[PDB]
Amino acid sequence: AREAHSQIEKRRRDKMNSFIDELASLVPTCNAMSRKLDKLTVLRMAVQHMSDDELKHLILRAADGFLFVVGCDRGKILFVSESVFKILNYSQNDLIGQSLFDYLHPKDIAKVKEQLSSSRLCSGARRSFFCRMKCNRPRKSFCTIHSTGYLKSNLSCLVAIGRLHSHMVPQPANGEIRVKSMEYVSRHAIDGKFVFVDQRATAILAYLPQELLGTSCYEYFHQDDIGHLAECHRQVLQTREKITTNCYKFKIKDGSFITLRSRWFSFMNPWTKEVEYIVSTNTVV
Amino acid sequence: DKDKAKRVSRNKSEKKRRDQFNVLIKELGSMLPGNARKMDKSTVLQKSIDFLRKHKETTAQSNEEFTQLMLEALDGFFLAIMTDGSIIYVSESVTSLLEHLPSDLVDQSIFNFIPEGEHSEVYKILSTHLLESDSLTPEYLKSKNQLEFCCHMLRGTIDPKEPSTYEYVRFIGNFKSLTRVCFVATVRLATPQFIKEMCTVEEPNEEFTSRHSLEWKFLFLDHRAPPIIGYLPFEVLGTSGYDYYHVDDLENLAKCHEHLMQYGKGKSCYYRFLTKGQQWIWLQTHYYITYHQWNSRPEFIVCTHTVVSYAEVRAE
Amino acid sequence: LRDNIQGITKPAIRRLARRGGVKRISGLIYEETRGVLKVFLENVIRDAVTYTEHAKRKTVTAMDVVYALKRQGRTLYGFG
Amino acid sequence: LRDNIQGITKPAIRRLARRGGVKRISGLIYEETRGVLKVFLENVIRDAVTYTEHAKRKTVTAMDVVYALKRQGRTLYGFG
Amino acid sequence: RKESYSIYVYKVLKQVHPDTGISSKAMGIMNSFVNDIFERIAGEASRLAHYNKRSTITSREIQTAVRLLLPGELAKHAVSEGTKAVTKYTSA
Amino acid sequence: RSRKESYSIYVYKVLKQVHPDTGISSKAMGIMNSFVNDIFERIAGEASRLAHYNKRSTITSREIQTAVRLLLPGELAKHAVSEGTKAVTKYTSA
Amino acid sequence: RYRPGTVALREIRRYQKSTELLIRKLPFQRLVREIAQDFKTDLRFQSSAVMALQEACEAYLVGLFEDTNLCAIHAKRVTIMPKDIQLARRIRGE
Amino acid sequence: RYRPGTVALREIRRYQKSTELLIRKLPFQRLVREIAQDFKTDLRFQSSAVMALQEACEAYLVGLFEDTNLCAIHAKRVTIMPKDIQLARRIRGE
Amino acid sequence: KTRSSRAGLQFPVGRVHRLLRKGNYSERVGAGAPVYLAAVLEYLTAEILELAGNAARDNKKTRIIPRHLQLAIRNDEELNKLLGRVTIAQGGVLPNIQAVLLPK
Amino acid sequence: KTRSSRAGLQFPVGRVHRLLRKGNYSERVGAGAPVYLAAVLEYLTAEILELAGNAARDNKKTRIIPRHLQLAIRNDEELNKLLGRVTIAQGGVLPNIQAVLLPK
DNA sequence: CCGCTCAATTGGTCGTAGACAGCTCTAGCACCGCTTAAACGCACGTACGCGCTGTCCCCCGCGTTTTAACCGCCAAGGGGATTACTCCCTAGTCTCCAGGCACGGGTCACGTGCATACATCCTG
DNA sequence: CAGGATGTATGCACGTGACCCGTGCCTGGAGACTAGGGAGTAATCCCCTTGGCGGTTAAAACGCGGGGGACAGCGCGTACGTGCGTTTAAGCGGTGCTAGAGCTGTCTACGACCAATTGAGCGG
């Protein structure tokens, strides 16, 4: 019985050796080598030895804005796509090897430093922010760029696409088809101060998130609509029920007004039975 | 002092060699197709032998991170349909943009989602275009196969009572023959989506833990949350848990928490959480309450958060 | 309340030590003894209370003290 | 069987004492240790045998040793 | 209703010391003693039956428990007493 | 042939969820089996007495929780009680 | 006056002969409640429970003192030190 | 020559590090039979039973030795005496 | 006829039998089991009472008190081993003083 | 489906239930009791194995041996309280050396 | 001592836990031959245990003063103990099938032996 | 710098020791269902603990004196530790035999259970 066992071990050794030599035969370097390579070396060389282009065109033709890569340690631009010349009018040679902070607006640089900070691309590494970037051809010295991307590992960097969205809304919905309008979410203190605002608001309101937070919605509401909106505000504080406003004008960064309609409610935290904030969903008319 | 560890140095060295071999076996096996556990080393090498044969042949006869990034920035998805309108493939990103599962689109007619007044445009685009390729030039490179057109598409929904709602999208793509002729395009929403819902979890299962005060403020956040929610513990501590919840889900969660206040234990409804990366992620949470021994009254809430798929949310 | 451990007076400790056959006591003993007694009481009380809580009672009975001592390896006779 | 207690050698005792962290041993310890061991071992055996007798068996099992140790507050893991 | 051994303890005391009475405090001690020994034997007998896969308790388990639980001199007497009691009981 | 129950399956699985890169010796496994039955008896015994002391005829999570609070050190008891609470909650809810 | 140690031997004989509690009852009751309040407030206590605790506590401390006395004697000391108590406690399993 | 006590330290470290039985197994097995014959002659033993006894015995003695060592140290001594063993056994109520 | 009487015992066989059936000690209890046990309980009880009665007499008392039970149990080495972990309410302690404490 | 699966437990709730229903611990066993206990057993098991796995790696081992279980138990104050009187086959000891013995 | 149960005991019926007879193989008991690490006995050196002197300061004994403890009384009412009804929880029953377990075959980790080449070193 | 000789380390093959997968498979877990006893609950009571009021008093707090005990320092010698050679019996690896452990099947005497009777035990 012991003899059978021992020869089974021989069979195992023989089978392994047979496969190691066979594995070696598939590696050009191992096959070219005259000498009988050791088992460790064969395996090392074997692991070294171990459509997408169609998709590349499919996605690139649909591409918009520009890709850029910026280092987290210094804000240095490591790469940018040629399409950036359409948007910022700077060339690849003007941006690469220079700090992104040299092109960002001073108020947005602080936000980018925070965005670049760490916390198949995973959502945890995901970053998305609006910022103002300098243009080679000029307030018009800057344009508002939406930057969305993920943090990537020697120098850590953000890989993101910068997109220059139109402040105008192209192709209005047809009356025949029920089409979802543009929307943004914001939340307000009891006195109407922004305590939260999203990027959709910035695309719609032109104001970047830091330009809205800590200010009253009444600073942007048109006085013709404030009387109505103020009534909705006074009422919404009294109820959990959603109150929908009429269409109203809201001031945007470029100094113009746009027409919005919004649904408001006062959210109560059941643990304290207290209103945390006014919650608003705004809709573009 | 007395000489020692001579035997240990030799035994360690012999063992070190065995460890090096074991590392290479693991590495070699890891790259294989048809990966399985409990394979013997002989099987690992045999599959590695066959893999190298297949790898050399397939590469001789022949972008992910970029493609994901560009699709998200564009607020778009790949969509491929037959001339007959039947959908053959769609990128998962469509679920975040139009709330459609791949299972809702694939094998279905595209005209089920296009408004009836726009059917003729897409039927014309599919039916008018015909091309036979030569043996030298790939179809995608031919300007004849490249096409750009726009149409509306119906959105999916969790609650079917919601009135039919559509999105205007642009198709940028090319015609390709399959072993019939399909059209494949990146579909971009004309209306930008600066915030979207994560509908599929990148891992089969993931979880994170937190503790909350009797005001529902964060008392604790574990090391597992930040990879999921993007926030480090100090970024959430002292803030209300509600600050991260979706506008519609705030009310349903309040009801769930009221139930928890009543029984001290339970499970939440499905809800969305706003990540630092500005994505809404669908979650479901298990809760229990811990009590102050002196009087057996509540002191804090312990929360176990499970990330869930859009399909799981809509299923119940 | 508080500070009732000091209610275990030096003489009270002397008497106990004498029953134990102790002829002479250092001053450091008295504080040490109080510490030990406090722990002992905490152990018995914690268990006696635990029994009381399980029974959903608010009054601690001698039987709970007995059950606490029994599980601790100490058996006391004459209290039911 | 006699004098098998001598089977517990002085070196064996030294080594056990070393495992107990003992640096230095008086000569009287070796016999004292044998005496104490004899008693401890006897107490366990008497119980193990008693279990065996109750079981109406002629062979003592490890389980009887475990039970004998268990009731004596010498719970042992690894033998079931 | 509550039960005690005070009747039986008293009767036993009069067998050994007819001239002697018992205090209520001492009686409390004796009742605790009887219940404690009952628990010790009943517990040991239960474990013995368990270890031998027996569902029934017999005099063998108790005798064994007595031999295990009691000191040598007490065990010898207690066993003879139990043996006599069962023998007499069976005969009567 | 006869069959004997063991916890070896479950002890193994638990380790694989904690330290997947490690295994268990046969002696260590025998020790863990000895440990599980010991603790089981301690809890089941304590729970039995608690039912007796309160003239109850049924063992519930309350007896076990109490036995756990009595038997374990406070740190382990807190965790063990929470785990027992969660397991029952999840089970009864499904 | 008597030379020190003579009175102690008289006291030892007296207290060993005695059975009554050597510790003051009311201070003890306050101490019990002071401790018990930490596990649960608004507790009530039977007078029998208090006596049970006092009897158990004195028996415990006296037993500890006996072992403590032996330790001091073993060290060829008459006066007992905290270190004698700590050793006895450690050996006893505390 | 190694100075007195340097060997003992190496031995302590070595024996504490190891897990092997220190008592010679056959002598032990005979000792078990030598005692067991007093309760019942013509008695047989499982080999595992003998090892179980030995492991319990060595563990017991080691525990006793550690307490004994503390007693000698408490006395400001290094050498352990039978007196130190007897004290430890008395304190543990053996 | 009373089972206790058949066994020649003072202790109640019926109560013991019931107590063995209670407590969940077993699924079944042998008829001779409570008889054997009652004899043991009675025997041990008698040993303590007899010794305690002597202690009472030594103290010139005609009634047993916990002090007497304590002395009897602690003086008898077999009972001391059996009940060495037991505490007796108002038992006091044995009058033991170490010789090293005595004057010389 | 197994109750253990329904409770998210690894331990055999069905086995635990049988073991609680047997052994005469009570006349009846609550349906939730086995689940609660299985969770406790699993928790304690995990705590020991977690420490043991560290002990193995701290010594460059990939295999848990009795020594690791002993070391884990004696180093962990709570486990040593629970298992302080327990002896382990080939358990070994903590490397306790008194300062008076050490060179200085 | 007096009154009144219903706990204790009788005498059945019933199902089965254990005793009993029997067989099957396991592990222990008994013994030998050979290897050599542990065990024994002896020689030599000194660190450690022990006894002793001599400070020096800590505790014990005693008195006197002051404080809370015991003892006794009281009332307030809360909580444990009790009895009465509902119903729902799990033991008990029957059934089905797959998860955990044992046995066989096969595989991996280990030291240990050996071949072999390279490090190195002695002298020309 | 060369060649022959010696040792370190690399590399492999070797079988044993430890280990796991597969196949079988059946036992025991889970599911469905019911019966009726246990537990939960409401409604009640009234015994015991809480709490205070007041006085008497021993017990506790505090202060001082001075002898006794704890302790440090010093010296003595010897019982112990350390090293060595010699020996032996413990380990190890066998062989050889079967008493006893352990499981299988039969059948009984046994205790559980219930209806009936009665007189030892409990309240006052």
Author numbering:
A (entry chain N): 80 to 129, 150 to 218, 245 to 263, 282 to 296, 316 to 447
B (entry chain M): 30 to 91, 107 to 223, 248 to 384
C (entry chain F), D (entry chain B): 22 to 101
E (entry chain D): 33 to 124
F (entry chain H): 31 to 124
G (entry chain E), H (entry chain A): 40 to 133
I (entry chain C), J (entry chain G): 15 to 118
Please give sentences taken from the publication describing this entry.
The basic helix–loop–helix (bHLH) family of transcription factors recognizes DNA motifs known as E-boxes (CANNTG) and includes 108 members. We focused on two structurally and evolutionarily distinct bHLH members from the bHLH-LZ and bHLH-PAS clades, represented by the proliferation regulator MYC-MAX and the circadian TF CLOCK-BMAL1, respectively. Structural studies with engineered or native nucleosome sequences show that MYC-MAX or CLOCK-BMAL1 triggers the release of DNA from histones to gain access.
To dissect the molecular basis of CLOCK-BMAL1 binding throughout the nucleosome, we determined cryo-electron microscopy (cryo-EM) structures of CLOCK-BMAL1 bound to a solvent-exposed motif at SHL+5.8 (CLOCK-BMAL1-NCPSHL+5.8) with an overall resolution of 3.6 Å, and at a histone-facing E-box at SHL−6.2 (CLOCK-BMAL1-NCPSHL−6.2) at 3.8 Å. In the CLOCK-BMAL1-NCPSHL+5.8 structure, the nucleosomal DNA is distorted to accommodate CLOCK-BMAL1, consistent with the E-box not being fully accessible to the bHLH DNA-binding fold. The CLOCK-BMAL1 bHLH fold is oriented perpendicular to the plane of the nucleosomal disc. It binds the solvent-facing E-box by separating the DNA from histones H3 and H2A over around 17 bp from SHL+7.5 to SHL+5.5. Cross-linking mass spectrometry (XL-MS) confirmed the assignment with the N-terminal basic helix of the CLOCK bHLH domain sandwiched between histone H2A loop 2 (L2) and the DNA duplex. In addition to the bHLH–H2A interaction, we observe a more prominent TF–histone interface (around 300 Å2) between the PAS domains of CLOCK and histones H2B, H3 and H4, made possible by the flexible linkers between the PAS-AB and bHLH domains. The CLOCK PAS domains bind to the H2B C-terminal helix and the junction between the H3 α1 helix and its L1 loop (designated H3α1 L1 elbow). The CLOCK PAS-B HI loop is adjacent to the H3α1 L1 elbow (Lys79 and Thr80) and is immersed in interactions with the histone core, implying that histone engagement by CLOCK-BMAL1 spatially competes with CRY binding. CLOCK-BMAL1 binding at SHL+5.8 is therefore incompatible with chromatin binders that engulf nucleosomes but compatible with single acidic patch binders that bind nucleosomes along with CLOCK-BMAL1. CLOCK-BMAL1 at the histone-facing E-box (SHL−6.2) differs from the solvent-facing E-box (SHL+5.8) in the extent of DNA release and the detailed histone contacts.
